[PDB]
């Protein structure tokens with residue numbers, strides 16, 4: 001199973017940035033430079049970063065290259081602790 | 094200990110300690126709400142660090 | 144498929160059966176990429192409103208469901224690539240639940256929120 005990495009994102013642009021990343025993946029899916037990340041999560045109340053599921057940080061870097069909203073997250077992504085990995089998808093009400 | 098003196102004009106300028114306590118209370122309230130409601134604890138962590 | 148991707152951020156809705164997220168206009172034009180064979184909401188705004196909800200929390204962009212933990216946790220690993228909600232508020236009408244069951248389609252609530 002892959003890991004999750006946090007990537008700094010322009011505040012308030014998390015959903016738009018995720019949508020740009022899927023459009024990029026779809027555009028490149030039949031090329032020789034596909035995205036190797038596994039998912040992106042933008043939790044309802046998270047501000048200033050997104051979560052990306054991938055096996056390698058280098059895959060994250062390559063996927064997020066050129067994404068303006070992630071320019072401040074291009075050089076460093078932080079791994080989500082496995083024991084806290086399910087918390088990413090918790091939605092309390 | 095942190096008198097808010099007026100600058101050359103009329104706006105009340107706050108002391109450095111006042112500004113720092115303001116930042117402390119901002120992150121403290123943010124963390125308090127993030128623990129009152131399930132915030133995935135990642136933000137809770139980062140918040141405690143800040 | 145690019146057609147699956149939400150065209151904008153206004154009037155987003157989530158399918159109550161699979162959690163796929165698209166705009167109301169996209170649901171009207173193309174139906175649900177996953178459920179439209181069964182729900183048949185294409186061309187019927189009322190059916191879209193019946194099968195989708197504007198009240199949802201969080202989203203999950205699922206591209207490779209066959210190689211993701213998130214897709215397993217969310218029970219969407221057998222669905223098409225697309226945007227999905229973390230939790231969806233609402234319930235399919237009893238008639239739709241009954242017909243799904245009569246057609247072998249089980250319905251498990253997509254509301255994953257911890258309530259209190």
Ligand SMILES: [Zn+2]
Nearest residue numbers: 158161175178
């Ligand atoms: Zn659906």
